Amino acid sequence: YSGRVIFCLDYIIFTLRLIHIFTVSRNLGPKIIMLQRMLIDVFFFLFLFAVW
């Protein structure tokens, strides 16, 4: 069971790399690039939410 759990977590890590490898399509990649610039807003929202 412990090994199966480790496998599932490894699968989670493996899957998300698809979004990264799909940055050259030229049909939706420029949108993927802009996600990096939106982290500060998320962090600010999380700070306020956690305090409340």
Ligand X SMILES: CC(C)CCC[C@@H](C)[C@H]1CC[C@H]2[C@@H]3CC=C4C[C@@H](OC(=O)CCC(=O)O)CC[C@]4(C)[C@H]3CC[C@]12C
Ligand Y SMILES: C[C@H](NC(=O)N1CCc2cccnc2[C@H]1c1ccc(C(F)(F)F)cc1)C(F)(F)F
Residue closest to 23 by CA, chosen among 15, 31, 13, 14: 31
Give alpha helix (H) positions in the chain. Answer: 2-21, 29-34, 39-51
- Residue 8 or residue 13: which is nearer to ligand Y going by CB? 13
Q: How far is the CB of 15 from a copy of itself (least distance, A)?
A: 4
- Residue 1 or residue 42: which is nearer to ligand Y going by CB? 42
Does 13 contact ligand Y by CB under 6 A? no
Residue closest to 22 by CA, chosen among 12, 33, 9, 38: 33
- 1 to 52, contacts with ligand X by CB under 6 A? 9, 12, 24-27, 36, 47, 50
